[PDB]
Scaffold this motif. Structure first.
Motif, PDB file in Angstrom:
ATOM      1  N   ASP A  20      30.232  43.611  45.641  1.00  0.00           N
ATOM      2  CA  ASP A  20      31.200  44.615  46.110  1.00  0.00           C
ATOM      3  C   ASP A  20      32.392  44.752  45.628  1.00  0.00           C
ATOM      4  O   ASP A  20      32.559  44.135  44.502  1.00  0.00           O
ATOM      5  CB  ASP A  20      31.381  44.426  47.865  1.00  0.00           C
ATOM      6  N   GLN A  21      33.498  45.434  46.120  1.00  0.00           N
ATOM      7  CA  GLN A  21      34.710  45.794  45.544  1.00  0.00           C
ATOM      8  C   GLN A  21      34.857  46.047  44.111  1.00  0.00           C
ATOM      9  O   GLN A  21      35.135  45.076  43.386  1.00  0.00           O
ATOM     10  CB  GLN A  21      35.694  44.860  46.155  1.00  0.00           C
ATOM     11  N   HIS A  22      34.563  47.151  43.651  1.00  0.00           N
ATOM     12  CA  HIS A  22      34.183  47.511  42.342  1.00  0.00           C
ATOM     13  C   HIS A  22      35.352  48.448  41.663  1.00  0.00           C
ATOM     14  O   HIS A  22      35.813  49.460  42.603  1.00  0.00           O
ATOM     15  CB  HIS A  22      32.981  48.068  42.013  1.00  0.00           C
ATOM     16  N   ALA A  23      35.986  48.415  40.657  1.00  0.00           N
ATOM     17  CA  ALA A  23      36.669  49.633  39.933  1.00  0.00           C
ATOM     18  C   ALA A  23      37.060  48.962  38.600  1.00  0.00           C
ATOM     19  O   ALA A  23      36.418  48.046  38.016  1.00  0.00           O
ATOM     20  CB  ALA A  23      38.057  49.726  40.633  1.00  0.00           C
ATOM     21  N   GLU A  24      37.959  49.981  37.796  1.00  0.00           N
ATOM     22  CA  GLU A  24      38.181  49.589  36.382  1.00  0.00           C
ATOM     23  C   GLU A  24      39.724  49.043  36.468  1.00  0.00           C
ATOM     24  O   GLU A  24      40.524  49.830  37.097  1.00  0.00           O
ATOM     25  CB  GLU A  24      38.092  50.988  35.795  1.00  0.00           C
ATOM     26  N   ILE A  25      39.847  48.005  35.830  1.00  0.00           N
ATOM     27  CA  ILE A  25      40.964  47.351  35.561  1.00  0.00           C
ATOM     28  C   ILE A  25      41.783  47.684  34.274  1.00  0.00           C
ATOM     29  O   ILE A  25      41.394  47.561  33.200  1.00  0.00           O
ATOM     30  CB  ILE A  25      40.968  45.634  35.630  1.00  0.00           C
ATOM     31  N   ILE A  26      42.477  48.836  34.571  1.00  0.00           N
ATOM     32  CA  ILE A  26      43.498  49.426  33.319  1.00  0.00           C
ATOM     33  C   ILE A  26      44.849  48.839  33.429  1.00  0.00           C
ATOM     34  O   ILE A  26      45.497  48.811  32.236  1.00  0.00           O
ATOM     35  CB  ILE A  26      43.353  50.959  33.263  1.00  0.00           C
ATOM     36  N   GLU A  27      45.250  48.299  34.445  1.00  0.00           N
ATOM     37  CA  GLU A  27      46.596  47.651  34.466  1.00  0.00           C
ATOM     38  C   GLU A  27      46.446  46.494  35.233  1.00  0.00           C
ATOM     39  O   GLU A  27      45.981  46.168  36.277  1.00  0.00           O
ATOM     40  CB  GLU A  27      47.495  48.664  35.200  1.00  0.00           C
ATOM     41  N   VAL A  28      46.577  45.539  34.504  1.00  0.00           N
ATOM     42  CA  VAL A  28      46.719  44.052  35.036  1.00  0.00           C
ATOM     43  C   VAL A  28      48.085  43.507  35.481  1.00  0.00           C
ATOM     44  O   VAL A  28      48.753  43.346  34.416  1.00  0.00           O
ATOM     45  CB  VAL A  28      45.934  42.867  34.029  1.00  0.00           C
ATOM     46  N   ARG A  29      47.958  43.469  36.686  1.00  0.00           N
ATOM     47  CA  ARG A  29      49.515  42.720  37.058  1.00  0.00           C
ATOM     48  C   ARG A  29      49.509  41.305  37.278  1.00  0.00           C
ATOM     49  O   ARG A  29      50.258  40.594  38.047  1.00  0.00           O
ATOM     50  CB  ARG A  29      49.872  43.578  38.488  1.00  0.00           C
ATOM     51  N   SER A  30      48.959  40.577  36.388  1.00  0.00           N
ATOM     52  CA  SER A  30      48.796  39.049  36.004  1.00  0.00           C
ATOM     53  C   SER A  30      48.600  38.626  34.661  1.00  0.00           C
ATOM     54  O   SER A  30      47.960  39.468  33.807  1.00  0.00           O
ATOM     55  CB  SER A  30      47.732  38.438  36.840  1.00  0.00           C
TER      56      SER A  30
END
Length: 80
Positions: A20-30
């Motif tokens: 579950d919980q899906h999306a595109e990571i375009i900005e990584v805050r780590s």
């Protein structure tokens, strides 16, 4: 967990059954792999910042289409 930009985020079910919980990571805050993340619902249609949960995995384009539709409705339903 280690994150990467241009890839998709998943939560739940590392055993591989229900991802579950899906999306595109375009900005990584780590620099490595720690929430939160700035995520885009691509196959859904919106940008935001979300807090994923346990069993977070990194997928690619195909795992994104169908699964991100349903699983973004899961992820970005709250914690936004």
């Amino acid at each position: 967990m280690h994150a990467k930009v241009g890839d998709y985020l998943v939560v739940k079910g590392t055993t591989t059954e229900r991802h579950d919980q899906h999306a595109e990571i375009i900005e990584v805050r780590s620099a490595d792999g720690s929430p939160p993340y700035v995520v885009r619902w691509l196959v859904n249609g919106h940008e935001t910042t979300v807090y994923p949960g346990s069993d977070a995995v990194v997928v690619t384009a195909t795992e994104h289409a169908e699964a991100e539709k349903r699983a973004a409705a899961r992820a970005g339903h709250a914690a936004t």
